[PDB]
Amino acid sequence: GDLINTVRGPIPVSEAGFTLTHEHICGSSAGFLRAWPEFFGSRKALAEKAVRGLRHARSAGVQTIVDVSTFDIGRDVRLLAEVSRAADVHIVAATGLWFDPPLSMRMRSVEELTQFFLREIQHGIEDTGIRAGIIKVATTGKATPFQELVLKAAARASLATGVPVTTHTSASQRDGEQQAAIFESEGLSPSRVCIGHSDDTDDLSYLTGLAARGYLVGLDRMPYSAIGLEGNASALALFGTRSWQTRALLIKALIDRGYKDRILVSHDWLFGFSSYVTNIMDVMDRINPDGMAFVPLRVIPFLREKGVPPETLAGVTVANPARFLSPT
């Protein structure tokens, strides 16, 4: 009877089922959806699009997503609850800080940040009573001084609550190694940590080094590719030039090296996106019309056809998220 908190309340761990561990309803900024909803057409249009997309994922077998939007990604837990209910897909919300914190966060101490993360896990987000079930943190290269405090505060909040920590990295810069060192300096167990965007690199020395230490490896950008769009500089910079099959081969590469229990798979998809160039959501929807159904529709069959046993795929998509999310 282990439980996880969702935007609709507590659920049994065993009901999470097929879980995408790094997703977003909307990638935005604090206050932005409230102040400028017309950027997304309207709030109603954004919610309707998210409901359609989540229903499509559900039809393809997805039962839960972890929306890793923090305060500074503009997380709107009321929107999450509305779309979760309408689409019948569980959504786990996040606390933490990504790489766009405002001054009122950047000026805070490790102790103050710990209190904020604990508020969102133990009390509730804003005035809603909805509790976060994961802590999201970020570096983009070597940690800034402030990011070091964020990572330490995340470790402290995790140790106090059992909730896991998940990260954004610049994978080509091997950020996960420094992240791990900071977390371990606070006594955090690697089994509570997912080093994300790890499919942005093919450096298996880096990835197996983390997996060997007990970290979860987040292969979470499966549909990201600018192949065919190389003349679009903004798409090229965000999506890269590696195909989805190349990204998916990393799942098999880690399985083949003994690390099936250390893999989490996701898309890093969204239904609105205001923190990048205007039009980016349209580019993305053309790349991947299947949205959050892409992993079950394309990635899982690709792996099965390469010989990965169904039981292993179920372990990656069901058992690993359940172990990760269960407070421990």
Annotated binding site for Fe(2+), which residues? 22, 24, 136, 268
Shortest Å, Cβ 136 to F ion: 9
Pick what 220 binds: Co ion, F ion, none; C-beta below 5 to 8 Å, kind-dependent.
none
| Cβ-based nearer residue to F ion, 6 or 167 | 167
Q: What is the CA radius of gyration of the chain?
A: 18
| Cβ-based nearer residue to F ion, 170 or 232 | 170
| Cβ-based nearer residue to Co ion, 66 or 180 | 66
Shortest Å, Cβ 76 to Co ion: 15
Shortest Å, Cβ 140 to Co ion: 9
Residue 199 in contact with F ion, rule: CB under 5 A: no
- Nearest residue to F ion, scored by beta-carbon proximity: 268
Q: Which residues are annotated as a binding site?
A: 22, 24, 136, 168, 197, 268
Q: Which residues bind Co ion (CB under 5 A)?
A: 168, 268
285's CB contacts (< 8 A; 6+ apart) are 291
Shortest Å, Cβ 20 to Co ion: 11
| Cβ-based nearer residue to F ion, 175 or 268 | 268
Q: How many residues contact F ion, by CB under 5 A?
A: 1
Residue 268 in contact with F ion, rule: CB under 5 A: yes
Shortest Å, Cβ 152 to Co ion: 20
| Cβ-based nearer residue to F ion, 199 or 268 | 268
Stretch that binds F ion, among 73-81, 227-235, 268-276, 315-323 (CB under 5 A): 268-276
Q: Residues 219-258: x/- map of binding to F ion (CB under 5 A)?
A: ----------------------------------------
| Cβ-based nearer residue to Co ion, 122 or 234 | 234
Dihedral angle computed from the Cα positions of residues 207, 209, 213 and 216, in that order, rounded to the nearest 10 degrees: 0
Q: Which residues are annotated as a binding site for Zn(2+)?
A: 22, 24, 136, 168, 197, 268
Shortest Å, Cβ 51 to F ion: 22
Q: Of 293, 303, 301, 315, give the one whose Cα is nearest residue 55.
A: 293
| Cβ-based nearer residue to Co ion, 115 or 170 | 170
Pick what 199 binds: Co ion, F ion, none; C-beta below 5 to 8 Å, kind-dependent.
none
Q: What is the 3-state secondary structure (H, E, C) of the chain?
A: CCEEEECCEEEEHHHCCCEEEEECCEECCCCHHHHCHHHHCCHHHHHHHHHHHHHHHHHCCCCEEEECCCHHHCCCHHHHHHHHHHHCCEEECEEECCCCCCHHHHCCCHHHHHHHHHHHHHHCCCCCCCCCCEEEEECCCCCCHHHHHHHHHHHHHHHHHCCCEEEECCHHHCHHHHHHHHHHHCCCCHHHEEECCHHHCCCHHHHHHHHHCCCEEEECCCCCCCCCCCCCHHHHHHHCCCCHHHHHHHHHHHHHCCCHHHEEECCCCCCEECCCCCCHHHHHHHHCCCHHHHHHHHHHHHHHHCCCCHHHHHHHHHHHHHHHHCCC
Pick what 290 binds: Co ion, F ion, none; C-beta below 5 to 8 Å, kind-dependent.
none
List contacts with F ion (CB under 5 A).
Answer: 268
